[PDB]
Design an enzyme around this catalytic site. Structure first.
Site, PDB file in Angstrom:
ATOM      1  N   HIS A  69      28.423  43.267  40.054  1.00  0.00           N
ATOM      2  CA  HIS A  69      29.046  42.072  40.627  1.00  0.00           C
ATOM      3  C   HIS A  69      29.213  40.846  39.720  1.00  0.00           C
ATOM      4  O   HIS A  69      29.801  39.855  40.142  1.00  0.00           O
ATOM      5  CB  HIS A  69      28.256  41.622  41.865  1.00  0.00           C
ATOM      6  N   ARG A  93      28.891  28.888  46.915  1.00  0.00           N
ATOM      7  CA  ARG A  93      27.616  28.418  46.384  1.00  0.00           C
ATOM      8  C   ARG A  93      27.888  27.447  45.247  1.00  0.00           C
ATOM      9  O   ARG A  93      28.908  27.565  44.559  1.00  0.00           O
ATOM     10  CB  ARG A  93      26.768  29.591  45.886  1.00  0.00           C
ATOM     11  N   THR A 147      35.568  36.426  47.406  1.00  0.00           N
ATOM     12  CA  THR A 147      36.085  36.944  48.674  1.00  0.00           C
ATOM     13  C   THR A 147      36.545  35.817  49.594  1.00  0.00           C
ATOM     14  O   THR A 147      37.378  36.019  50.482  1.00  0.00           O
ATOM     15  CB  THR A 147      35.039  37.839  49.389  1.00  0.00           C
TER      16      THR A 147
HETATM   17  O1  GLC Z   1      31.525  41.377  44.999  1.00  0.00           O
HETATM   18  C1  GLC Z   1      30.984  40.414  45.878  1.00  0.00           C
HETATM   19  C2  GLC Z   1      30.724  39.092  45.212  1.00  0.00           C
HETATM   20  O2  GLC Z   1      29.510  39.211  44.405  1.00  0.00           O
HETATM   21  C3  GLC Z   1      29.100  37.980  43.771  1.00  0.00           C
HETATM   22  O3  GLC Z   1      28.845  36.987  44.748  1.00  0.00           O
HETATM   23  C4  GLC Z   1      30.203  37.538  42.792  1.00  0.00           C
HETATM   24  O4  GLC Z   1      29.863  36.313  42.190  1.00  0.00           O
HETATM   25  C5  GLC Z   1      31.580  37.411  43.522  1.00  0.00           C
HETATM   26  O5  GLC Z   1      32.638  37.189  42.602  1.00  0.00           O
HETATM   27  C6  GLC Z   1      31.939  38.682  44.314  1.00  0.00           C
HETATM   28  O6  GLC Z   1      33.117  38.458  45.111  1.00  0.00           O
HETATM   29  O1  FPO Z   2      32.318  32.128  46.033  1.00  0.00           O
HETATM   30  P1  FPO Z   2      33.437  33.169  46.026  1.00  0.00           P
HETATM   31  O2  FPO Z   2      34.434  32.973  47.110  1.00  0.00           O
HETATM   32  O3  FPO Z   2      34.064  33.512  44.698  1.00  0.00           O
HETATM   33  F1  FPO Z   2      32.707  34.516  46.392  1.00  0.00           F
END
Ligand code: GLC
Ligand code: FPO
Ligand code: IMP
Ligand code: IMP
Ligand code: GLC
Ligand code: FPO
Lengths: 830, 830
Positions: free
Chosen positions: A365, A557, A664
């Site tokens: 990830h 975050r 996401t």
């Molecule tokens: O894959 C799920 C998520 O994992 C972590 O939070 C990554 O920082 C993010 O980019 C990704 O979308």
């Molecule tokens: O903080 P994110 O939306 O990239 F997962």
């Protein structure tokens, strides 16, 4: 009312008497003393009743048919509330709405009483939750396995502009969804030593902690499939945790039980950051050790625990089992599977390794170094002695493979080692997962390429077949139908309801891009959404915003790589421009920034203080008026996200190119009618690719440019010197313009920005504000803005987690998805 | 089947479908995977359903009518299992027996699965449980208030003849009877300091622990009254227990919550022994602080929280409230009531004191010094600063009262002080209770006299009106109908069923003392009982006994004052006599000794080892045969007592005269067909008085003789010198006859017996064995033994806790008992 199902005559009457049964027999209350919380529980118990029948037959079914089982191991499951989602998946929403209405209650008011299941930090934990929903909807025999923390992610409080953390006692009033299963309690071992006797090694003199399971039902979307999420809880044995005699105190011995049970007490609040604490390692082994025994017990029964070849042949293990590793957190599953097969089942090393590699798969990830799990050997040595030995042996044989493939490449050997030498020896958990898995995947196309070109290049050269990609997705049920019924309804009015489980169908909305009524409707639901959020704001948090302004929101975050700081710079730029020419027209904006900072992340907490500090100045400047407001969204969590996303106009996805694996939240905004301003990072690339770059606001450096700059050497002074507006902002922060009482309060941010910016904020500044001017220009043309919105919504279909799960299933797990309705829920009692 | 109620057609069918509803919807299981434990829970939930309706109307009733409320404060509630008892009180036993039978299950087998609620140590905790049942049966608006320990009295295991203690995780599988009430959580303060400002003192800077209540229903016998037992649980606030900032660790702060919550973690396993630990004092204040706020909240509503004189006049407080102190454990209720009235409500001292003395009453349970609670002032000083101040002020004014009544009696002043000077200053909790209560009672006639003549003589001379007596009693429901249905049935056959709630009616059985059929029947049920126990023994514990022998049983906590040692001496005497004349006939006996020893009570644990050691020798001597067996009853608890008592022939109540306050086990044996061999101690006197001394086996010193001996000086050597049989036994213990591998194992017992016997075992030896010969002689005449048994049973009526409760109600609480059936349970939903 909407397509929240049918409000049948027989069923609304049935719901009502059951609501009353529970309020009386279950809650032991009478209408005269019942509070909204009691009413919420009566309803929750009534709704839960509807899926126990389906839950029992779904599980009985898998036992009869015996298909390949999918085990999704994760230390995080960011579930959120489960009442509405259950109603939605069971087509009970309108019936319950009607029934409670007739009971004289407001269902929406009761839904707000449910506590969030915040057993996750951010992206990784929510992905797991979206996957669970999709696996159930696609009829897969899948099980979610994790830890039942009694304290999830902390509740964030803002005091004096600072974040304050407080325990999240989400179980305080009880959880009506889970079912404790004390009868399936399992033992987990820690410490001890390894005895090598005659026919094998023995893990001896260990400390035992019990793992008690709690099952929560996971209903698929309107198909009668109810899968299971098993969460383990730590319990002390009543023997040794009392019986290891010879003075200490009987009372103390009983009080000390809360030492074994601390294992499942709290979730580590770290997002994309590794903390090598012993308690974390214990949590990681605890979930792995308990889950695997369960997995093997289920396999030993199957149809082998009847006949088949007869002889516990684990050769078919990989044909019946698939275990997915959500990051390296559950990576000890590899050496634990080997330990059981080799030490307990007595299989030869090579047969055992073949089985292990064939059933395990790993999902990466992130690419940032500080997020990588590197456990000190002395820790593994003391806590899990036999697992260390197995890891050394795995490393030995793996490295022999490398040497044989790349003769004389002595540096490659040290680079690929699972063991890292230096200050303290460490075990690289990611190298362990690649070696012991038949598949390794990234979560977005560019991230998956980066893994092959950079971080895992040597491993890719060794076994190119292992590396895949599986772009992330979100569930259209919770992230569309549940949080934005208004939008779901007008889409259904034109193209029907089949898109809820076939998001690709949204493409058909492309033919309404010039439809006058649709444009008006799409624009209307967004306005209604903004009005409802603006209201909630004053209701629960108190101090007005303007619903006519552009809702600029960045919620995720708090991180240096996410660049909330680059957002801050823009906000201050807008403010300064207004103060320079007060009587000039500018598009009004409400910029909302929300997110949690890890407790020990000093820079992240300093950023939250800067955001609130900017708000203190901007929000009280009379010359600014209602043209610009800066609000910090407190306690950002799943239930809060369901409220802001449907109300957003602009989505901020501005991480430095090459740092956000996928993301996401971006997908959540796209499917809900927000336009996106961002960098070519993570899934942003695939989204702009799907909607067309013309319908996306892309700016800044591409991955190539970042690398070019690093070769050269990043010097922030240069940008400071050539951009007066930027210079003006840094001098404002430096002199206390945003912190009068404490003029040097933000010295760490300025110092960092100027001398140690790992994410080159200044390098993307000029292009970011230039680009922001372009979205303001388009917002001034409501019709064109909405038409571009329709282009995004109609093209977001690819980002459904149903598509992601179907790919995992076919290309990794070796199972076929199925949208077949399980044979009704119908009574039955054999 | 028996008079366990009617097995109606409509109700057996109703029970069955509800059993299936729960097994499906509540337990989420299907008949194919259901185990006996699941079946037990389905039943428990089905039975619990029948009393929620009555529970709700009983409580609603008390709110409407608003009668005087009785609050029974106790740190111990020895409840036992609650399934059968609930069936019995609701006349559901036969219907449930039938329904489960038709479901193909054995109800008795399911009942054994229920874990005991062992929140008590012995006599004191069980009394509270019997009182609760009687208060409900007599229709009193009574509430039981205590602590919900997650670990009750430890489970005793015998290893190598030694007691092993292990945590009693009674909540492991859940408690289907309790109802968590998180909405009524209350705050309790600790530590802090006292600020004296302008208009009153203020308790400031305190540490807050939350008290969360759990309610358990207490059904009266067939009258539709369901009272409440509220048990408090400790919970940490989520603020300060996290919010007191400035470094320490976020994770550690969350883990440290289990420091405030340890307050309700475990019950102190001490019986008639005081341990001055801080954790105990915290438990004592915790239950008192939480309970009182609840009591005042209920009073503020009453009918005053409507109108009445209008002005929160606490003058009527004593007319609406009565709080009974079960021993001195909840004694802080006195200074806490003063603190609230004076500090919070702002009443003048004298008005507040009048109210406090008028609503509080104290029950004393023992005269032994080591059982008396004397808390070091430095402890009270640190933990409860304001309560110490209030206690000093109470002492000041009380002593002024004494000085005024006894001018110049300077010694009396120091003797009566609530504050004890010396090594460390201590607060005499018993002196506190006498001063702040309008009534003080003993638990048996002789004990109550002893309090007036000895221990509390000075207080009696000051206020003679305060001292009363309330002889203990036991509930005929659990201790007759529930554990001995066979005996209850044959009694009912002759005199009906009204005696279950009017035990005095057993006297009518006196006219069947010469009835041939009754004698045969009484004798038959006892034989059936012995056969069932002898079976259970081999079933669960394994190694045969003879059901034709005399069942000699002594079951109670292990203590030096209870004299299990004097029993041991007799057993060894029997053994030696048999070995001297092997071919001489002696009445066969199975002597069973059971009971728990406090973990730190070394002498008590040494006695358990002696008992098992005697068994090791006696039980394996071929010459002895089946004439004598020595068995130690493991884990003696309530559910075990329900099994042995109905099967006993001889009841052993042999404490040294003047040491056993009352005793209740003696009463249990008398009502169940056992003859009693004992000393003129506690309630034994009243029992022999009721049945006639000719139908009782009394032996040994009377209280007067013990005192005569103490004047003289007790010298055990004398007895050793003049009794050869006694000498022979002591030399056997001394030389290792009972401990071959460790010859000096019992040196502490012999040393004690010879040099520091506080309970003069040797002084009662001769009369005890002489008396034991007399019961053997009578056992040889089955007809006369049974006739004497009938004389005991028919005369045990006075020892029902209904009689005890009626007296407390009339002579102390000022309320009238009522055997009026509450207006049915009938549905209703306002
Ligand atoms: O894959 C799920 C998520 O994992 C972590 O939070 C990554 O920082 C993010 O980019 C990704 O979308
Ligand atoms: O903080 P994110 O939306 O990239 F997962
Ligand atoms: O041995 C068995 N006999 C009959 N049904 C079983 C058996 N084992 C599992 N099942 C069914 O399969 C469901 C799955 O249980 P689990 O996956 O082992 O937790 C159960 O609730 C039962 O319906
Ligand atoms: O303010 C009130 N209105 C109506 N009924 C009440 C009220 N307070 C208590 N009751 C009733 O009294 C029972 C006693 O509650 P408690 O004694 O305060 O715990 C409740 O469950 C209600 O039926
Ligand atoms: O009053 C209840 C009981 O309290 C204590 O356990 C006493 O030792 C006992 O004699 C009495 O019967
Ligand atoms: O142990 P006892 O029976 O005297 F209460």
């Amino acid at each position: 009312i909407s397509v929240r199902g049918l409000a049948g005559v027989e069923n609304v009457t049935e719901l009502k008497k059951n609501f009353n049964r529970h309020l009386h027999f279950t809650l032991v209350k009478d209408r005269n003393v019942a509070t909204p919380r009691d009413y919420y529980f009566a309803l929750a118990h009534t709704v839960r009743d509807h899926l126990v029948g389906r839950w029992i037959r779904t599980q009985q079914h898998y036992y009869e048919k015996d298909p390949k089982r999918i085990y999704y191991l994760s230390l995080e499951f960011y579930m959120g509330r489960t009442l509405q989602n259950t109603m939605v998946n069971l087509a009970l929403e309108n019936a319950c709405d009607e029934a409670t209405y007739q009971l004289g209650l407001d269902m929406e008011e009761l839904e707000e009483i449910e506590e969030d299941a915040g057993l996750g930090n951010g992206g990784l934990g929510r992905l797991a939750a979206c996957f669970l929903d999709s696996m159930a909807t696609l009829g897969l025999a899948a099980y979610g396995y994790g830890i039942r923390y009694e304290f999830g992610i902390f509740n964030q409080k803002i005091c004096g502009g600072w974040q304050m953390e407080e325990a999240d006692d989400w179980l305080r009033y009880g959880n009506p969804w889970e079912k404790a299963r004390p009868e399936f309690t399992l033992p987990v071992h820690f410490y001890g030593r390894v005895e090598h006797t005659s026919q094998g090694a023995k893990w001896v003199d260990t400390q035992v902690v019990l793992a008690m399971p709690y099952d929560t039902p996971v209903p698929g979307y309107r198909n009668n499939v109810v899968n299971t999420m098993r969460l383990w809880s730590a319990k002390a044995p009543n023997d040794f945790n009392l019986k290891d005699f010879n003075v200490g105190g009987y009372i103390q011995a009983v009080l000390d039980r809360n030492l074994a049970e601390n294992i499942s007490r709290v979730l580590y609040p770290n997002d994309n950051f590794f903390e090598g604490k012993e308690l974390r390692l214990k949590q990681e082994y605890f979930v792995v050790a308990a889950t695997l025994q369960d997995i093997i017990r289920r396999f030993k029964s199957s149809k082998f625990g009847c006949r088949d070849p007869v002889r516990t042949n684990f050769d078919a293990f990989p044909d019946k089992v698939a275990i997915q590793l959500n990051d390296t957190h559950p990576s000890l599953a590899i050496p634990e599977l080997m330990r059981v097969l080799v030490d307990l089942e007595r299989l030869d090393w090579d047969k055992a390794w073949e089985v292990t590699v064939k059933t395990c798969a790993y999902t990466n990830h992130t690419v940032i170094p500080e997020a990588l799990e590197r456990w000190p050997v002395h820790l593994l040595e003391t806590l899990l002695p036999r697992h260390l030995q197995i890891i050394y042996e795995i490393n030995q044989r793996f490295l022999n493979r490398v040497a044989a493939a790349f003769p004389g490449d002595v540096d490659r050997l040290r680079r690929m080692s699972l063991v890292e030498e230096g200050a303290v020896k460490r075990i690289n958990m990611a190298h362990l997962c690649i070696a012991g898995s038949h598949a390794v995947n990234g979560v977005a196309r560019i991230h998956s390429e980066i893994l092959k070109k950079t971080i895992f290049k040597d491993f890719y050269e060794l076994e190119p077949h292992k590396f895949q990609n599986k772009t992330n997705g979100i569930t259209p049920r919770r992230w569309l139908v549940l949080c934005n019924p208004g939008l779901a309804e007008i889409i259904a009015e034109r193209i029907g309801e089949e898109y809820i489980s076939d998001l690709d169908q949204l493409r058909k909305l492309l033919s309404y891009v010039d439809d006058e009524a649709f444009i008006r409707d799409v624009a209307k639901v967004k306005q209604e959404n903004k009005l409802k959020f603006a209201a909630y704001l004053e209701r629960e948090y108190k101090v007005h915003i303007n619903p006519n302004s552009l809702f600029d929101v960045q919620v995720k975050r708090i991180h240096e790589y996410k660049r909330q700081l680059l957002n801050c710079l823009h906000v201050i730029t807008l403010y300064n421009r207004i103060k320079k020419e007060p009587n000039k027209f500018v598009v009004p904006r409400t910029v909302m920034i929300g997110g949690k900072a890890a407790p020990g992340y000093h820079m992240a907490k300093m950023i939250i203080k800067l955001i609130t500090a900017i708000g203190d100045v901007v929000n009280h400047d009379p010359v600014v008026g209602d043209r610009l407001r800066v609000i910090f969204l407190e306690n950002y969590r799943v239930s809060l996200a369901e409220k802001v996303i449907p109300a957003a106009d602009l989505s901020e996805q501005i991480s430095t190119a090459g740092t956000e694996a996928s993301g996401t939240g971006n997908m959540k905004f796209m499917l809900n009618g927000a336009l996106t301003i961002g960098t070519m990072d993570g899934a942003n690339v695939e989204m702009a690719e799907e909607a067309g770059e013309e319908n996306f606001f892309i700016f800044g450096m591409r991955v190539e440019d970042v690398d070019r700059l690093d070769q050269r050497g990043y010097n922030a002074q240069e940008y400071y010197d050539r951009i007066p507006e930027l210079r003006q902002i840094i001098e404002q922060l430096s002199s206390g313009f945003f912190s009068p009482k404490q003029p040097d309060l933000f010295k760490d941010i300025v110092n960092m920005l100027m001398h140690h910016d790992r994410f080159k904020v200044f390098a993307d500044y000029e292009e970011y504000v230039k680009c922001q001017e372009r979205v303001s220009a388009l917002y001034k043309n409501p019709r064109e803005w909405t038409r571009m919105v329709i282009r995004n919504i109609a093209t977001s279909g690819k980002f459904s987690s149903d598509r992601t799960i179907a790919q995992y299933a076919r290309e990794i797990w070796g199972v076929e998805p199925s949208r077949q309705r399980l044979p009704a829920p119908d009574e039955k009692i054999p």
